[PDB]
């Protein structure tokens, strides 16, 4: 009993993101994808905005070089996976209230 591999997709399409426990965001929230072509690879950073907050996510560079993530969708009946490389980005969400500050001194 072992699952066969049907197809592999190697180029950027889907991504995975760590958020606070409860993140749901608006029904329409948008995720800005970026690309970096460094040396031979590419580092990705995610950025989004909402009516109050704005969320930006990036890769843990020291784990990227030492681990690489793959996601696939398998069918039991077709025994087939569409494999997808996706960067995992730890993204944080700041609001408009998080953009206020005091004087430069007392």
């Amino acid at each position: 009993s072992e699952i066969e591999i049907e197809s592999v997709q190697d180029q950027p399409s889907v991504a995975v993101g760590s958020f606070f426990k409860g993140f749901r965001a608006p029904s329409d929230t948008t995720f800005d994808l970026y690309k970096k072509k460094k040396s031979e690879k590419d580092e990705f950073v995610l950025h989004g905005e909402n009516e109050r907050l704005e969320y930006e996510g990036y890769t843990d560079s020291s784990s990227q070089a030492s681990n690489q993530y793959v996601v696939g969708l398998f069918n039991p009946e077709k025994k087939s996976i569409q494999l997808y490389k996706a960067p995992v980005l730890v993204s944080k969400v700041v609001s408009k209230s998080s953009k206020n500050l005091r004087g430069p001194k007392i």
């Binding site: 009993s1 749901r24 970026y34 996601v71």
Partner: protein
């Protein structure tokens, strides 16, 4: 914004057949997460002994491997949606990622199976008869 004087805009994405063979609780589709050391070439695989459920040991370029499958972290028989391992789905090369779902219920889904490839090592046993000379 479009920050990091080291990034480029995206121009090339790929459709995700989320629902071309989905049916609400009727198609037994799955999405899996697997961790791969860079040392392995994913494109050079052919099948995946994930079907071993637990005994997913695997041998890649004569190298012996173990495919860690875990329920924890996200298939726990305890809480509803124990993960922030968010899925971000695209649509087109000219559109930004989308929150995974299975209908318009504003709820993040989970990965049916999570796997992790860990490189095994012999660590051969001590030959006592050789070491324990009196």
């Amino acid at each position: 914004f479009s920050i990091p004087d080291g990034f480029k805009k995206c121009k090339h994405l790929k459709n995700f057949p989320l629902n071309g063979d989905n049916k609400k609780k009727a198609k037994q589709q799955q999405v899996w997460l697997i961790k791969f050391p860079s040392n392995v070439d994913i494109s050079k695989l052919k099948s995946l002994p994930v079907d071993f459920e637990s005994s997913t040991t695997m041998t890649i370029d004569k190298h012996d491997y173990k495919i860690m499958d875990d329920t924890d972290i996200e298939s726990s028989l305890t809480q509803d949606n124990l993960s922030n391992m968010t899925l971000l789905v695209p649509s087109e090369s000219k559109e930004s990622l989308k929150i995974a779902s299975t209908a318009k219920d504003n709820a993040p889904l989970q990965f049916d199976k999570v796997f992790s490839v860990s490189e095994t090592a012999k660590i051969p046993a001590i030959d006592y008869s050789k070491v324990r000379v009196p």
